[PDB]
Design a binder for this molecule. Structure first.
Ligand SMILES: *[C@@H]1O[C@H](CO)[C@@H](O)[C@H](O)[C@H]1NC(C)=O
Ligand SMILES: *[C@@H]1O[C@H](CO)[C@@H](O)[C@H](O)[C@H]1NC(C)=O
Ligand SMILES: *[C@@H]1O[C@H](CO)[C@@H](O)[C@H](O)[C@H]1NC(C)=O
Lengths: 188, 125, 399, 51, 94
């Protein structure tokens, strides 16, 4: 069936799998007409920690997308978190004069404010702060996630290339290296 | 009106000193480093009853992604919103109990696909 | 060479039977076993169970009847499990840590028989019904993948996701009647099925002309309280008779420890919630071998596992309502069709299966107002429109 | 002398003027010689000087 | 009318390519020699270029052992019966 993988005569490929299966499939593929010339790949964030070294058979290109280590300015993130909690508390006290209490422990079944939990759950998703919109659906999705793009250089590491914000893209280079056929023709 | 923050097994280099100006939101910062299921359990049930507040928010460095599962099963006891940050139940929760309460600060697969397509467009393929 | 097994059941005699069975199997390399009882409020469950990891390498635990996700506190350590009531959810997924083997088809798999059921009567126009939330989604995905077009086959006309618990569904039923098919499939909670059946009192004007193949909850009592007659349904060969299930489990674990006899690499998880960072009781290999022909050739699981188990073998039993109570009529051993022996009583037209649909003959036609092709004129007082004549005395037709 | 046939030996001749140019007889052709991509395979042309 | 040539350092080497090239330069048939390759056993990288050959018809000249070796390397990499056809001189075997 991976022979049928050679039937794919397309410039761009997509792929979704785990790191071990990724290594296995890349091994099987690079043997059979799967290389950097005449190809390009894209894989979701679950490849690995970028600082972690990539395996050997893991070829060039391999554009992906995830958070970034820079996004992980820990203090800024915990600040944003405590802020979202506080602003949701303020909102659920603005639309109604009932206050969430301290609660009881893992003692028994006690769900006095259970109905309020759903009511609390209601306001915890459209609540914003600090100008930015930190909203959620009902499935743990930052409705506007600060994403970045990464591709690997010769073999070295992952370069912070593109920035994403609300269908907005900051991009660079307009150009991709082939490991000639690309000709720049001037006009008028 | 409270919040609590935990750093389990993680390089505990942080001090807030700037929460009281966020215009009372009162912390009680703790930092274990045992990466222990049972310790997580006994602390969380300890910290809730002790720290009479709601809405803890923490993070972590390792990536044994069962932490999301254990934490959500904690959230099974309702009125207990939890909110992960760096690891903070690192990777993602694919789905969720209905009665639960949790969030992740993580990109869902579909958003990643939409980004992939925006690239495919903007570079004309 | 000592290995330990644990259990979380509700009756002590069950655990004693389990110990007797495991000693009988080890007589058939020490294989001592432990056990504990379930918890009242489910939160102390994890603390109670990881102390049952106090023996060096406690392997898969066996639990009885929603439960506390011991697999969670075990997935942290790569430990298998048992399979007793593995249906109330989609446990059978690698979202929950790869720590669960079912051995018992979860309700979703049941749908597959339905598909095979169609081959008996060549129905090809079916309406689906699903409760919008997290299990009917599984039923849906299974029915979709079971629709192969490897070529005029069957085709599911329209699916109608309904919100759980909402009493009023009559709008969806008026939607149903407007459809053309005559075969319904309902898969939801028994309380919801009862609500539908009651609300089917006005929908029973599908009844004598229609037929449905409801699932497995809707033949429980809370649905018997409002069940109509023609309720062809399904059943599994074994309910909550755990003892035989304990037998199958101990057979699997015995052949498993026989596989464990090899010493390519052996290592135990720590004894108890000590706080070890990572666990590796060679979980990958343990599971890779447990998925390969356990063959505890005992009572039931006489065939190998799928990615979920299921014994790749259906002990499926049809059940028809003889207007007041169930009747086992025929069975299926996988695709093995063992037809019935008694008369399949359908709704009132009790002898013939209205196999198919009532091809409608009304047609709602739409057009547009184009000058030399159609014509639009206002009516007279009497509502109709005046008769004309063409130049040749031909009566002009109008609508 | 465009591409003709042969007595069925090799079937690539370029008789005539192209023959004199290719087979070492001459080294330049000044004449009303058209431009034809067949002829452009074996020859090298100057710029056009009459359309 | 499309093909290629694949050879490997065996005597009676260049005669082969030369005879064909001489034949394709004639007859007004419009033949199209896509590519000529060269493998030296005593690898797959150049045989990776063997996947560059997008032609329906292929030619090959080598010894039986090298033939087995190359066929092994090839059938793994997009070399099969569908979308291909091969021709080899008499020296394959009895
Ligand atoms: C954290 O790690 C080191 C020992 O490895 C030390 O600072 C301390 O004992 C640990 N924390 C606790 C709560 O024991
Ligand atoms: C449902 O709604 C309709 C009108 O929308 C109403 O007539 C009916 O009583 C309601 N209840 C049921 C059980 O149909
Ligand atoms: C359970 O099954 C075993 C054998 O299949 C049988 O001996 C026993 O009576 C059954 N018990 C119940 C309660 O069905």
């Amino acid at each position: 069936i991976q022979n049928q993988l050679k039937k794919l005569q397309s410039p761009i490929i997509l792929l979704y799998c785990t790191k071990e299966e990724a290594t296995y499939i890349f091994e099987v593929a690079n043997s059979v007409g799967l290389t950097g010339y005449g190809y390009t790949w894209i894989v979701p964030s679950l490849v690995a920690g970028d600082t972690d070294t990539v395996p050997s058979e893991f070829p060039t290109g391999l554009i992906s997308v995830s958070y970034d280590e820079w996004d992980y300015g820990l203090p800024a993130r915990v600040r944003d978190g405590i802020a979202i909690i506080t602003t949701a508390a303020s909102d659920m006290l603005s639309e109604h004069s009932f206050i969430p209490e301290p609660k009881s422990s893992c003692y028994n079944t006690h769900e006095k404010r259970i109905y309020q939990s759903n009511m609390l759950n209601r306001y915890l998703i459209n609540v914003t702060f600090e100008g930015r919109d930190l909203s959620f659906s009902e499935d743990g999705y930052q409705m506007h996630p600060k994403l970045v793009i990464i591709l690997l250089n010769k073999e070295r590491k992952w370069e912070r290339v593109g920035k994403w914000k609300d269908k907005s893209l900051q991009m660079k280079y307009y150009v991709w290296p082939r490991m000639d056929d690309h000709l720049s023709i001037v006009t008028l | 009106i409270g919040i609590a923050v935990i750093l389990v097994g993680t390089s505990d280099e942080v001090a807030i000193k700037d929460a009281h100006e966020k215009d009372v939101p009162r912390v009680e910062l703790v930092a274990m480093n045992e990466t222990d299921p049972k310790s997580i359990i006994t602390r969380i049930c300890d910290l809730m009853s002790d720290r009479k507040i709601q809405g803890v928010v923490f993070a972590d460095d390792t990536d044994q992604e069962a932490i999301a599962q254990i934490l959500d099963f904690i959230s099974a006891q309702t009125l207990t919103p939890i909110l992960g940050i760096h690891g903070g139940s690192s990777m993602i929760m694919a789905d969720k109990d209905e009665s639960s309460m949790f969030f992740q600060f993580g990109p869902s697969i579909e958003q990643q696909a939409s980004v992939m397509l925006n690239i495919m467009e903007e570079y004309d393929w | 060479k000592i290995v330990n097994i644990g259990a979380v059941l509700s009756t002590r005699k069950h655990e004693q039977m389990f110990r007797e069975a495991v000693n009988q199997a080890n007589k058939r390399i020490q294989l001592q076993a432990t056990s504990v009882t379930h918890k009242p409020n489910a939160i102390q469950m994890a603390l109670s169970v990881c102390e049952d990891l106090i023996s060096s390498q406690v392997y898969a635990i066996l639990v009885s009847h929603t439960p506390t996700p011991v697999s969670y506190t075990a997935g942290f350590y790569r430990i298998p499990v048992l399979g007793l009531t593995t249906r109330m959810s989609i446990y059978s997924d690698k979202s929950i840590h790869l720590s669960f083997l079912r051995t018992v088809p979860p309700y979703s798999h049941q749908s597959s028989v339905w598909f095979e059921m169609m081959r008996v009567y060549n129905w090809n126009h079916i309406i689906l019904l699903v409760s919008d939330d997290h299990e009917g989604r599984a039923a849906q995905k299974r029915l979709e993948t079971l629709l192969e077009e490897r070529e005029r086959g069957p085709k599911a006309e329209k699916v109608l996701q309904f919100d759980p618990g909402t009493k009023n569904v009559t709008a969806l039923l008026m939607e149903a009647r407007e459809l053309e098919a005559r075969v319904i499939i309902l898969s939801a909670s028994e309380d919801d099925a009862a609500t539908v059946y009651r609300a089917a009192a006005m929908l029973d004007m599908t009844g004598s002309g229609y037929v449905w193949l409801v699932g497995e909850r809707e033949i429980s009592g809370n649905a018997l309280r409002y069940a109509p007659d023609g309720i062809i349904g399904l059943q599994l060969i074994n309910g909550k008779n755990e003892s035989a299930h304990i037998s199958d489990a101990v057979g699997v674990v015995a052949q498993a420890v026989h596989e464990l006899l090899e010493k390519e690499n052996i290592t135990d998880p720590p004894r108890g919630c000590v706080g070890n960072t990572n666990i590796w009781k060679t979980g990958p290999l343990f599971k890779r071998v447990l998925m390969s022909s356990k063959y505890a050739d005992g009572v039931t699981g006489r065939v190998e596992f799928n990615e979920d188990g299921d014994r790749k073998f259906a002990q499926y039993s049809i059940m028809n309502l003889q207007n007041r109570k169930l009747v086992q009529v025929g069975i299926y051993n996988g695709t093995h069709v063992i037809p019935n022996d008694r008369k399949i009583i359908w709704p009132g037209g009790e002898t013939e299966k209205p196999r198919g649909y009532q091809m409608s003959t009304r047609l709602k036609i739409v057009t547009i107002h184009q000058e030399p092709f159609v014509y639009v004129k206002p009516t007279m007082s009497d509502g109709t429109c005046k008769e004309e004549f063409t130049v040749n005395g031909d009566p002009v037709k109008k609508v | 002398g465009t591409q003709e046939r042969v007595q069925n030996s090799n079937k690539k001749e370029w008789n005539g003027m192209m023959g004199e140019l290719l087979s070492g007889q001459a080294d330049m052709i000044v004449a009303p010689l058209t431009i034809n991509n067949e002829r452009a395979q074996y020859i090298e042309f100057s710029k056009p000087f009459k359309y | 009318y499309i093909f290629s040539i694949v050879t490997t350092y065996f005597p009676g080497y260049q005669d082969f390519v030369n005879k064909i090239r001489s034949t394709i330069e004639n007859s007004f048939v419009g033949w199209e020699l896509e590519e000529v390759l060269l493998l030296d056993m005593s690898d797959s990288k150049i045989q990776n270029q063997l996947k560059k050959l997008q032609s329906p018809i292929i030619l090959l000249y080598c010894t039986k052992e090298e033939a087995t070796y190359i066929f092994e390397v090839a059938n793994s990499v997009g070399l099969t019966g569908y979308g291909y056809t091969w021709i080899v001189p008499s020296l394959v075997a009895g």
